[PDB]
């Protein structure tokens, strides 16, 4: 929505920090699966 995200199952605002926390936990293997070179 505009420049921000929403999560709905019941709807919440998804902040960049929450996304950062989630992404920081993602592993190298998951990055390769996602097609992103972790290095």
């Amino acid at each position: 929505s505009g420049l921000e995200l929403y999560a709905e199952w019941k709807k919440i605002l998804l902040s960049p920090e929450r996304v950062h926390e989630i992404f920081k936990r993602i592993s190298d293997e998951e990055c390769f699966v996602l097609g992103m070179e972790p290095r």
Binding site: S15, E17, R18, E21, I22
Partner: protein
């Protein structure tokens, strides 16, 4: 004026009459004379006598006359302290400063005498709410610690992390 103007003057005169200090109970006839509305219709007299003069939150019937509820009105430091104390004990919450100032002239004298025992909350409409300072569990910290406290985020975290933060050290 014969409809609302007369009854409004009854309400306004009685309300202002209390501000003069004449807390003694009054009758509609006395107010009708003081307002010169003796010509108000019989149906209006009985209606005001049975509704307007009894349903107001500050008016109570005493020995058949109407009074400004002297027990509710705060007119001294002890009453102010006791009311806030009892209200806090019962969890009733705070009381608007205007209710005391309307009851006790220059309420600030009683308020300033109690001082820190009275907690002042300012509403968005600039009105002040008075609360009892129950010192059962009191604690305060330095600005550096209040600054330190404000610096740490709490909402933008996962529940798993909130629980994980505990176990990181092995507990």
């Amino acid at each position: 004026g014969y409809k609302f103007g007369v009854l409004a003057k009854i309400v306004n005169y009685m309300k202002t009459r209390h501000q003069r200090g004449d807390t003694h109970p009054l009758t509609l006839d006395e107010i009708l004379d003081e307002t010169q509305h003796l010509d108000i219709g019989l149906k209006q007299k009985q209606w005001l006598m049975t509704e307007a003069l009894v349903n107001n939150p500050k008016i109570e019937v005493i020995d058949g006359k109407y009074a400004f509820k002297p027990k509710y009105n705060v007119r001294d430091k002890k009453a102010l302290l006791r009311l806030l104390d009892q209200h806090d004990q019962r969890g009733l919450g705070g009381i608007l400063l205007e209710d005391i100032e309307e009851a006790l002239p220059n309420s600030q004298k009683a308020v300033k005498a109690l001082g820190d025992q009275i907690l002042f909350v300012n509403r968005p409409d600039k009105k002040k709410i008075l609360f009892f300072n129950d010192k059962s569990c009191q604690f305060s910290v330095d600005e550096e610690f209040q600054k330190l406290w404000r610096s740490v985020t709490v909402d933008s975290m996962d529940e798993e992390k909130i629980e994980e933060y505990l176990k990181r050290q092995g507990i």
